[PDB]
């Protein structure tokens, strides 16, 4: 037998082991193993919190953002920051209209504005405006919170990068940007799947595309990529749920504080 569904949830509350694979010969040995792993998880958790208090660090998600950002600046990307509020018109230009499944996921603030569910609308706007000021390509990125009604969080942190303007072998260039990010995040091993998706062990962590010309008749060449940063951190740190590494009032850097 295996751990019961309820035992798995109990083990994952304080523990970050891999519990779903354990197999046992009878209920007695399952229950003995469970008691031991619960005790170890809880004590390990307590020690980890005591260590953060004794030797505080930058938050794990902030650190991951800084590691990636310094890699992208070194590659010539400008960091931008855009508003969390976006307009209904802006969503509709992303083709996010009443009929699109994503539309039902939007948090509205009033009749005309919403919490952004992705960074792309704002980033494309900023890229196009920066291209008005130069003959060369423009490469930018943003990291920030996005929101969707719902490895899913209602508030999650997206990294979005974009490259607009003259570029040769766009697809190879985009794959290299993905490499830069994944390597800077400490996740060098990953699969590319088909638009390009990045997966680790079947779990999508990025969606990227060349030429998303989805207002103007004539477009600049453009490519971009969006990464879920809590997902990357969860996979790298081997946290047993996606709720432990990001923003929380129950978890702090993988450890449960209550």
Nearer to its own copies by C-beta: 49 or 173? 49
Measured CA to CA, the distance from residue 113 to residue 117 in angstroms comes to: 12
Name the nearest CA neighbour of 244 among 234, 236, 235. 234
Give the nearer residue to ligand T7Q in terms of CB position, either 92 or 209.
Answer: 209
Which neighbouring-strand residues pair with 114?
Answer: 86, 108
Tell me the window of 12-20, 83-91, 183-191, 218-226 that interacts with ligand T7Q (CB under 6 A). 218-226
Q: Which does 130 bind (CB under 5 to 8 A by kind): ligand T7Q, its own copies, ligand ATP, none?
A: its own copies
- Which range of residues in 17-25, 165-173, 196-204, 241-249 is near its own copies by CB under 8 A? 241-249
User: Residue 197 corresponds to which tokens in the numbers above?
Assistant: 């998706």
Pairing relationship of beta strands 78-79 and 138-147 according to DSSP bridges: parallel
Pattern of binders to ligand ATP over 222-251, x per CB under 6 A?
A: ----xxx-xx--------------------
Give the x-and-dash track for 106-125 against its own copies (CB under 8 A): -x-x------------x--x
The answer to the question of residue 203 lying near Mg ion (CB under 5 A) is: no
Asked whether the CA dihedral 96, 220, 157, 159 is positive or negative, the reply is positive
96 binds ligand T7Q (CB under 6 A): no
Nearer to ligand ATP, 5 or 150 (CB): 150
Phi, psi of 192, rounded to the nearest 5 degrees: -105, 135
The alpha carbon of residue 160 and the mean position of all alpha carbons in its chain are separated, in whole angstroms, by: 10
Q: Which of 138, 158, 208, 233 binds its own copies (CB under 8 A)?
A: 138
- Please give the span between the terminal C-alpha atoms of the chain, in angstroms, as a whole number: 31
- Between strands 85-87 and 255-256, the pairing is unpaired
Neighbours of 233 (CB within 10 A): 25
231 binds, among ligand T7Q, ligand ATP, Mg ion, none (CB under 5 to 8 A by kind): ligand ATP
Per partner kind, with CB cut-offs from 5 to 8 A, the member of ligand T7Q, ligand ATP, Mg ion, none near residue 150 is: ligand ATP
Residue ranges of E strands in 44-154: 78-79, 85-87, 113-115, 138-147
Dihedral sign from CA coordinates of 128, 134, 135, 136? negative
Which residues bind to ligand ATP, rule: CB under 6 A? 118, 148, 150, 152-153, 156, 158, 204-207, 226-228, 230-231
Binding residues for Mg(2+): 204, 207
Q: Which chain residues interact with ligand T7Q by CB under 6 A?
A: 118-120, 123-124, 127, 160, 162, 195, 207-209, 222, 224-226
């Amino acid at each position: 037998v295996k751990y019961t569904d309820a035992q798995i949830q109990r083990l994952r509350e304080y523990g970050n082991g891999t519990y779903e694979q354990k197999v046992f010969e009878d209920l007695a040995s399952r229950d003995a193993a469970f008691s031991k792993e619960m005790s170890v998880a809880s004590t390990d958790n307590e020690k980890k919190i005591k260590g953060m208090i004794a030797n505080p660090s930058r938050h794990g998600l902030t650190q991951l953002m800084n590691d990636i950002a310094d890699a992208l600046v070194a590659e010539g990307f400008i960091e931008v920051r855009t508003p969390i509020f976006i307009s209904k018109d802006a969503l509709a230009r992303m083709t996010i209209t009443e009929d699109k499944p994503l539309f039902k996921q939007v948090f509205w603030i009033d009749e005309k504005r919403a919490l952004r569910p992705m960074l792309a609308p704002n980033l494309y706007s900023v890229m196009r405006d920066l291209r008005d000021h130069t003959d060369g390509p423009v490469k930018i990125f943003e990291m920030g919170s996005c929101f969707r009604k719902e490895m899913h969080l209602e508030e999650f942190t997206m990294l979005a990068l974009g490259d607009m303007g003259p570029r040769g072998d766009a697809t190879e260039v985009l794959k290299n940007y993905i490499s830069v990010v994944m390597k800077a995040a400490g996740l060098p091993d990953y699969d590319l799947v088909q638009t390009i998706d990045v997966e680790i062990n079947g779990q999508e962590v990025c969606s990227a595309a060349v030429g998303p010309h989805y207002a103007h008749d004539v477009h600049e060449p453009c490519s971009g990529a969006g990464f879920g940063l809590e997902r990357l951190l969860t996979i790298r740190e081997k946290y047993s749920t996606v709720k432990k590494g990001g923003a929380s009032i129950s978890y702090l850097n993988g450890a449960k504080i209550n």
